[PDB]
Design a binder for this molecule. Structure first.
Ligand SMILES: [Ca+2]
Ligand SMILES: [Ca+2]
Ligand SMILES: [Ca+2]
Ligand SMILES: [Ca+2]
Lengths: 93, 93
């Protein structure tokens, strides 16, 4: 009943909807990835400042070297990004 | 404004409250870890079945080898656990 329980569900709930837009829901594509980070984290991840950076980000996600990113790869990185988001807050003071 | 934005905040919001119970909010202790996984994921992580498993889990979290777990270490693992939670759902059918 904790908020975290809701959050794990939240990640999947957003993933299911967004991934469905293209290809397999279970598989995340670079476009979808760009759109998820860009739209959900337009501020913290504001990729617009550096479009090239998207490729750099995907490269880290593709452990396989396949060139395509899996949700499993995505979840590991998002955990790091949320923490990184705090850095932005630190800028405030 | 996406749900994910709320979720990143949710993780920190729960972390701030729980970690504060003991030691440094910024530092996560084994007790607090046990309580967070056990209470927030009493079902999916039901550590009660295997108390010994808690040590196994912390060991993976401590990259440093310090024996103490940091939130940074915790966030990486939680991302994996949420996905693992789905496995439980799979059992349904
Ligand atoms: Ca997809
Ligand atoms: Ca891959
Ligand atoms: Ca603490
Ligand atoms: Ca450590």
């Amino acid at each position: 009943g904790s908020e975290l329980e809701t959050a794990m569900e939240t990640l999947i709930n957003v993933f299911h909807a967004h991934s469905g837009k293209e290809g397999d829901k279970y598989k995340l594509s670079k476009k979808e990835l760009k759109e998820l980070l860009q739209t959900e984290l337009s501020g913290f991840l504001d990729a617009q400042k550096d479009v090239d950076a998207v490729d750099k980000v995907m490269k880290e996600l593709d452990e396989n070297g396949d060139g395509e990113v899996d949700f499993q790869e995505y979840v590991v990185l998002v955990a790091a990004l949320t923490v990184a988001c705090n850095n932005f807050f630190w800028e405030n003071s």
